[PDB]
Symmetry: C3
Subunit: 195 residues, 3 copies
């Protein structure tokens, strides 16, 4: 499978998904994430289908490393190949947002990380960010571009985010541990599934 | 071939060279660069002969990655092996400059990046920088060391520099694409070539 | 062999050890380091036994790269596997310090770099730092955490530290050379050895 941007799958209004977080071949915890398809339909569907991992070239978040990590701020992942992609024949995802916007001020928010092409145009891919804290004077979450678009929230596993954040407390000369995504998937969306 | 620092080749007063810029196995554009041999004879000759790629251990810029890149500032390349070298049996190039100096204030200037040896002495190699913009308050080009010595200018392909610069617009968590040098070479210098 | 944290070996009050510093397959100099076992018994013993390299999984500093380096400040090494470890079946080393504390203000001090586990608890491993200068307004050694615990001093080879520091003088676009540890070992401790 691939999907078309012209004819988007529909995974539900609020798909829910999970991701194990792995460190040194051991699962340290599981994140459970509720998505807001009305924030950004194409970016939400790409996230959910990559979580399902059935799309083929197989495209999954499983095995992805957290490649940019910042104590008291965020973690970032999504290099599904090292590079990022999309379920839409790896087509860039346009910034076509839905009817609602979610502020980017709280701990455990999921967002998609923008990039700019050769013409200066904004696109999205599999690259995603999760916040480790709320905005406060002591961090730089208030500095994130509005284009760092919120598409979901963690509803289980904030304590796993805390473990990650503790382990990345900075010290000169200390390199961070390498976190990765383990098993991942979507929970059944019963409203979408019923017949 | 190798060359000798005591007996420098002469590629012309203003050799002209080209470099394709590659991203993801596709050529995104070509830079055409005019060099100022009177700025720095040995550093100019090393640049030009590496562009020709006929010197052997084969020493070419072809395939080199742009390893340090900074939005609104510069791109840097020259790791011809990952490390840098020279056509002079890989001897360091001394800071023996020519009769003229070129200011380092404009977009599309080519320069050689200095390094310091165990004794604190300055040398140059295949490592080179191209500016992505003019000096302005919003960038840090005015902070470059005088030792970041200008040896040339881009006379074709500034629009390729613009494409690069757009694609490296920073966003927290976004890793930059990897640019590299494709085919490269020197144009015939007709004054040097005529008989 | 492994060692036990409950039953620590004793390498002497002030074990002395050496490390060759290698750059490009050539030895550039040797560091000779005197340790203060009374600063931190378990962290000192781990350092000394890794220097001996007889402990097995073989655990040695020999071949380790200097992975974090900062001009006019410090160099850092200790990734004995790329990751760090300990001679105590790779158990974390607790912050159980000895009777004395050594200030962290001078050139050529050896220290152990802390890390934080998932619970926010501090531990140490094979990761170690050597200072390249004294504290001064122009550097950031005064910013080091008190947890960057001094366990020794260089008593021979400060001139080797100078060579390293010169070669890492920063220039935009210049990547640093890669330094590593060559042969290493402990000198006989005659008070411990006599019978
Ligand atoms: Cl579950
Ligand atoms: Cl620190
Ligand atoms: Cl051409
Ligand atoms: Cl941002
Ligand atoms: Cl010796
Ligand atoms: Cl500089």
């Amino acid at each position: 499978m691939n999907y078309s941007l012209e004819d988007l799958p529909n995974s539900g209004k609020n798909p829910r998904v999970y991701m194990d977080i792995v460190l040194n071949n051991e699962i340290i915890g599981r994140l459970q994430i509720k998505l807001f398809r009305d924030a950004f339909p194409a970016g939400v569907e790409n996230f959910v289908q990559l979580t399902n991992g059935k799309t083929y070239r197989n495209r999954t978040y499983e095995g992805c490393k957290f490649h940019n990590v910042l104590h008291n701020n965020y973690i970032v992942s999504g290099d599904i190949y090292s590079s990022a992609g999309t379920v839409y024949c790896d087509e860039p995802i346009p910034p076509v947002f839905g009817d609602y916007f979610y502020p980017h001020e709280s701990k455990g928010l999921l967002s998609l990380v923008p990039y700019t092409d050769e013409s200066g145009n904004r696109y999205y891919d599999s690259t995603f960010m999760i916040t480790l804290d709320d905005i406060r004077p002591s961090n730089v979450l208030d500095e994130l571009d509005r284009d760092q678009v919120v598409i979901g929230q963690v509803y289980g596993g904030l304590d796993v985010l805390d473990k990650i954040n503790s382990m990345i407390k900075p010290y000169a000369g200390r390199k961070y541990p390498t976190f990765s995504i383990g098993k991942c998937g979507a929970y059944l969306d019963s409203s979408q599934a019923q017949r």
